[PDB]
Structure formats: C-alpha cells, structure tokens
C-alpha cells in the first residue's frame, strides 16, 4: 500500500534471501569437503 | 534523494541480488552433478 508496507516487504524478501544464501553456503561446504 | 526513489533503488538491488543467488544455485547444482 504505502512506503511502510513496501519497506516491510523488502525486509521479508531479504530475510528469505538470507535463508536461500545460507543453503548455498551449505552446498558449497559439502562439495568443498568432498573435493578437498 | 527522497525516500520513494531510495525505496525503488533498494528494490532493484534486491531483485538483482536474487538473480545472483539463482546463478549461484545453478553453479552448485552443476558441480554436485559432476561430483555426485
């Protein structure tokens, strides 16, 4: 609706992107351990 | 500049970072398939 709502949506989006990013970190660590 | 312009800039940055996150997902899946 307003800036307040839009700002809250951006906060939720980055919160969710951080979960996604943590999952990519896990995958990299798994492959790193396999390779090295 | 103003809050409205700055909100749009933050949104565009988060959208571009989502593309980056997707690209890292693709790379991990590529390597996982190669290794495992």
């Amino acid at each position: 609706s307003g800036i307040v709502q839009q700002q809250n949506n951006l906060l939720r989006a980055i919160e969710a992107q951080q979960h996604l990013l943590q999952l990519t970190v896990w995958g990299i660590k798994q492959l790193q351990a396999r390779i090295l | 500049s103003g809050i409205v312009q700055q909100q749009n800039n933050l949104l565009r940055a988060i959208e571009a970072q989502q593309h980056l996150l997707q690209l890292t997902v693709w790379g991990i899946k590529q390597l996982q398939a190669r290794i495992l």
Binding site: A16, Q17, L23, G27 | I14, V25
Partner: peptide, 23 residues
C-alpha cells in the same frame, strides 16, 4: 544435516517465497 534432495526442496521453497514477495 540435510540430504541433497532436502536441500533442493528448500532452495525451491525459498525461491518461490522470494519471487512471490518481489511479485
């Protein structure tokens, strides 16, 4: 500890949530 299958599912779950938020 996750299986790779569970990893793939959660990746897609968070991706869909983000895309829905970003509209």
């Amino acid at each position: 500890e996750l299986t790779w299958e569970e990893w793939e599912k959660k990746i897609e779950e968070y991706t869909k949530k983000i895309e829905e938020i970003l509209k």
